[PDB]
């Protein structure tokens, strides 16, 4: 299915099966939240993100 929808579209369409326990860690990974602690606006934070 992703075979079908990757190579043939103008939009990205991905297919997968659900994990066993319906809400958990991808084991070999993380979930990083980059934070603005001093007084800055959206521009500077997104810039830091990039």
């Amino acid at each position: 299915a992703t075979r079908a929808f990757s190579q043939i579209k103008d939009a990205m369409v991905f297919a997968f099966n659900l994990p066993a326990i319906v809400e958990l860690g991808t084991a070999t990974g993380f979930d990083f939240e980059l934070i603005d602690q001093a007084g800055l606006g959206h521009e500077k934070l997104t810039q830091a993100r990039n």
């Binding site: 603005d36 007084g39 800055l40 606006g41």
Partner: protein, 50 residues
């Protein structure tokens, strides 16, 4: 009130954080009751009243 007690009226945006907006009489116009006189209310006719 809004002269001598004050008025939280509305909210603004300081360096990224929502904070309050107050409008109150200045320093010198509310220490002694003489200052009671100095304050004027405007009638339906357009003319102030002490």
């Amino acid at each position: 009130g809004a002269a001598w007690g004050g008025s939280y009226v509305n909210d603004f945006i300081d360096r990224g954080r929502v904070k309050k907006v107050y409008v109150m009489s200045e320093a010198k116009y509310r220490m002694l009751p003489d200052d009671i006189g100095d304050w004027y209310v405007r009638a339906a006719d357009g003319q102030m009243v002490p």
